[PDB]
């Protein structure tokens, strides 16, 4: 089962990367972020055989997933909520470097300590899975509210897709970070250690890592293959 | 009443006389000429700086300077070799559908939905481009402009009429009529003594610039003609239409020699031009491509795959070293 | 009644034109495009030393 | 009509400071690069400073770097040269010259009328061998000037300029690169050369052509003029 | 760009680009709307804040932090098929209809079918304006709404008549993704711009939904 996902990870991501990279003109702000995510998950899927330096790039990619997905959400909020005030392509490569940059700052210890790993875990939970989720929730909630006051036939499908994306992110990421929180509390002295529970916890790490891989493989489907604009480029190329 | 019968029989005489001359097709005389092979041409420059779509383009006589007109109300003069912007002229009206570069390089002309053919002077003592004259008199939009000298310009309008102006005085020296539809383009003969114009009524006619008379009329297209250009030797011209075909007409023979239709092509032609030798016939379609046709055998010799939108103009340098194409994606690409 | 008066007049001018066989007319288009063939950069790619682009 | 007028010269004590003003009227001043060119009493032209369009670029000749500073005031259509410490070597007539740079432009076409300044008491070198050349009307004449490097460039453009200074007037441009006739001059003038040797030839000499001819190079700064050749009638 | 002059030429090029870019920014907050309709149909006095500026006539009124440009193509007297592609990028098509001109009604219907079904405008929303309610209300009493529409079957009351006329215009949609924001206006109606402003907001939101991939 793991082997099948690996090609699915490469196959799906490559096409998304290929189609956008084949564009002969500028790429909208959303399009650029999608391109970054495509490569980000592309690197992670390449690690599948090894886990089934390697660790270091893993941490860089995982946060790339969350932060970029957060980055896409904010852009959609600006375009749709305050649409009157942002009528106009705008280059956004500045922010992407930061999100990749924020990965590098946390990734340095991977190449390179109890307290050190503790700070790593604390930062990981604080600004890797919580803040991105809160940002996505707020932005997409406002988009939903505005669409309910909108008019047309596209509003309902947009609401359905938004709910689907947020639910998918939550259900595919929460199991890993919940367990990371549990282990954090354990190491901080809030719980008791035993061999069987430790083994179950490591198995939980394994299963949740597989689930995160599944979300990475699904990223192309939910952010690219559903859009109308993307499909016409695929049909053209 | 009777004149209608006289009109009908006259057409029959022309058709009969036209048919008698036809002995063998062009493809039948040139069947043993070796092909031209696969023409591979790769983009050399990418002139960007336009915001809106680009609707017209013309090459300077010296094969180095360019002029392009866009919908954003800017008229830019490019340096082809270095991709520098020599000039950028603001336009009174943002709706432009043509632009011409004078042979001498001193003037440049523009026009569009405003029904006015403006002429700008580039070699001014004050160092900035100024509007020397505004030519008015057409009652519809303006389709194409072409310079004969520094004091004479021939224009084509949607009024179903072309004209020959006198830039100095500003009046309309000679007016040409006979069309029954919008005139969509024209091209000047190399010796600047005749010119042809293709209209929306699916017919092109040859006109005597000095005399103000229609010397010939050519038919065969099923729809409107969008572009036209003379063969380099001045004895034939090719036309592009919405019928998704190009045709080659011969003035001396007064007929149609060959057709450049393909089963895979569905959309209409927007521009047409010949190469210096006259062996390649380049046309830009609405499928975001320009196809190179072997003018002597009706064989696609290649494709200039570029641009993300419709191709709206074509151009071949007088020395024949390059080809430029403009498209609605707001980019000009020079192909060598 | 008067609009078509000139339409017939024009056709008479166009109908009296001394034409030539297409066989000859097509041949010239073959002769010319062959003579001025060595001076066409697009048709025969030029050496990279002589290309301004 | 195009017009450049300068003012602010006079007599100043050594070490004093003055401000020269060149006020333009009759063209798009914002789009022209303006030069300062000085001519010591019967010595010959010498470049001083240059400020581009939008003040993006500035240069100076080594003789005055630091002491002179050049500034431009676009909204007011004015050019300023601020001189801090004046030696006795700076006494000269200063000219305000315009220049517009683009493909096929004429970058020295107009010169100001000039102002007089009095003070109380590596580089391409261009030489004009002959100092005087007597001649009578209707006789063909030739003027030549050499150079250190080959002005011919990769582009194929030979950067050399020919100026004519009539008695009591400011110079006037004749040939701007090697053979292009400046607008407004009679066609009788012609120019030719190759690499490092150039010549200006006149046919059907007229009575208004008596004066001094300077050959200038614009390949790379600092600009340098020739000593000058005088035509005597 | 090694040469001295060729360096100065490059500056001029960069300074030109700066002005081209900046003029784009100053001309980014303008919404382009195309005006269409039959003659004497109120297409000249939709909004009393005209500030106009043969050929093409433009009106550039501004309102609520947004610049509106209306392009009137009346008077061309040509075949639309050849200059219509010029306005392919307009935000919305403002259509005018006079409910008091029965004879011209069919001409208006014909125009709507072509404009709505043109391949270029397959995605541009239409802001339908129905003008002169009071004249319509007064004229219906003297002449029943049957002569122009023999197929009409409902009552001869104002509300039903106005409702039916709207349906005929909407019945020419024959396509999805394109929505029509119908409105009724009188001669003494100051709040016409407000209707354009809000409807433009919904059209823009529809586009961004396409660009952002949510649809």
XYZ file of C-alpha atoms in Angstrom, chain D residues 59-232:
174
model
C 30.104 62.800 -14.174
C 32.941 65.298 -13.854
C 36.282 65.969 -15.490
C 39.293 65.203 -13.328
C 40.370 68.850 -13.362
C 37.366 69.926 -11.263
C 36.211 66.861 -9.316
C 35.057 67.859 -5.840
C 35.346 71.608 -6.363
C 32.422 71.765 -8.820
C 28.987 70.251 -8.259
C 26.235 70.110 -10.882
C 22.493 70.171 -10.199
C 19.272 70.363 -12.210
C 15.846 71.830 -11.379
C 13.293 70.163 -13.645
C 10.066 71.999 -12.672
C 11.761 75.387 -13.076
C 13.551 74.504 -16.349
C 16.971 75.495 -15.029
C 20.488 74.066 -14.837
C 22.887 74.999 -12.035
C 26.641 74.640 -11.593
C 28.013 75.365 -8.118
C 31.730 76.174 -7.908
C 33.292 76.126 -4.448
C 36.971 77.120 -4.741
C 38.183 78.795 -7.930
C 41.815 78.816 -9.001
C 43.183 81.119 -11.685
C 42.892 78.169 -14.101
C 39.077 78.284 -14.183
C 38.715 81.669 -15.892
C 36.857 80.906 -19.112
C 33.570 81.164 -20.979
C 31.108 78.458 -19.929
C 28.574 76.959 -22.337
C 25.314 75.144 -21.612
C 24.850 72.237 -24.018
C 21.965 69.805 -24.392
C 22.002 66.127 -25.309
C 19.313 63.486 -25.834
C 20.465 59.874 -26.080
C 18.509 57.251 -28.002
C 18.947 55.172 -31.133
C 19.726 57.578 -33.957
C 19.690 60.802 -31.934
C 21.742 63.972 -32.366
C 23.256 64.410 -28.895
C 24.900 67.850 -29.077
C 22.648 69.666 -31.515
C 22.259 72.936 -29.602
C 24.672 75.081 -27.593
C 23.950 78.014 -25.334
C 25.185 81.530 -25.936
C 27.567 81.275 -22.996
C 28.622 83.368 -20.008
C 32.000 84.911 -19.204
C 33.763 84.079 -15.933
C 36.904 85.875 -14.754
C 39.162 85.079 -11.799
C 41.601 87.736 -10.634
C 45.234 86.716 -10.263
C 43.864 56.927 -18.939
C 42.282 59.561 -21.184
C 41.829 59.445 -24.946
C 43.927 62.227 -26.479
C 42.794 63.752 -29.775
C 45.228 65.814 -31.844
C 44.743 68.154 -34.804
C 48.115 68.392 -36.525
C 47.597 71.572 -38.545
C 46.825 74.786 -36.675
C 45.844 76.981 -39.641
C 44.776 76.397 -43.242
C 44.451 79.441 -45.539
C 41.986 78.985 -48.396
C 39.827 80.985 -50.812
C 36.160 80.494 -51.749
C 35.328 77.618 -54.059
C 38.302 75.431 -53.097
C 37.996 71.955 -51.625
C 39.351 71.722 -48.080
C 40.166 68.838 -45.764
C 40.542 68.757 -41.978
C 41.860 65.694 -40.154
C 42.341 64.614 -36.551
C 43.762 61.441 -35.013
C 42.983 59.603 -31.776
C 44.637 57.373 -29.195
C 42.283 54.381 -29.184
C 40.083 53.150 -32.008
C 36.739 54.885 -31.541
C 35.112 52.135 -33.611
C 33.004 49.996 -31.283
C 31.413 46.562 -31.379
C 28.084 48.103 -32.388
C 29.661 49.374 -35.605
C 29.172 53.035 -34.650
C 32.181 55.361 -34.777
C 31.755 57.893 -31.956
C 33.214 61.131 -33.298
C 31.710 64.610 -33.535
C 32.652 67.663 -35.602
C 31.855 71.161 -34.332
C 32.254 74.510 -36.085
C 32.833 77.721 -34.130
C 32.380 80.955 -36.047
C 34.009 84.166 -34.788
C 32.085 85.614 -31.867
C 29.437 82.876 -31.671
C 28.896 79.596 -29.880
C 29.799 76.309 -31.588
C 27.445 74.461 -33.918
C 27.159 70.736 -34.588
C 27.952 69.393 -38.061
C 28.559 65.616 -37.984
C 27.485 63.611 -34.968
C 28.930 60.086 -35.290
C 31.154 59.887 -38.349
C 29.163 60.819 -41.468
C 25.644 61.895 -40.441
C 24.890 65.490 -41.396
C 23.328 67.362 -38.498
C 19.917 68.793 -39.297
C 20.083 72.343 -40.625
C 23.584 72.294 -42.141
C 24.115 72.408 -45.923
C 24.865 69.098 -47.601
C 28.274 70.296 -48.818
C 29.932 69.028 -45.633
C 30.978 65.388 -45.430
C 32.867 63.176 -43.020
C 34.753 59.910 -43.196
C 37.298 57.887 -41.285
C 38.280 54.476 -40.012
C 39.143 53.460 -36.473
C 41.758 56.047 -35.527
C 42.063 58.477 -38.471
C 39.202 60.770 -39.480
C 38.702 63.647 -41.881
C 36.107 66.321 -42.606
C 35.933 67.501 -46.218
C 34.224 70.635 -47.553
C 33.170 71.208 -51.166
C 32.333 74.649 -52.589
C 33.609 76.603 -49.604
C 31.452 79.616 -48.758
C 32.117 82.936 -47.043
C 30.327 81.907 -43.824
C 32.427 78.756 -43.284
C 35.458 80.605 -41.884
C 36.083 79.601 -38.288
C 37.597 76.979 -36.003
C 36.813 73.254 -36.181
C 36.942 70.965 -33.141
C 36.790 67.169 -33.320
C 35.345 65.471 -30.245
C 35.079 61.863 -29.081
C 32.085 60.532 -27.147
C 33.231 56.931 -26.684
C 33.739 57.161 -22.926
C 34.036 59.857 -20.297
C 35.689 62.243 -19.727
C 34.888 63.792 -23.104
C 37.900 65.257 -24.881
C 38.108 67.840 -27.655
C 40.832 68.443 -30.184
C 43.062 71.479 -30.024
C 41.226 72.892 -33.035
C 41.892 73.872 -36.645
C 41.340 77.415 -37.906
C 40.321 78.345 -41.450
C 41.624 81.710 -42.669
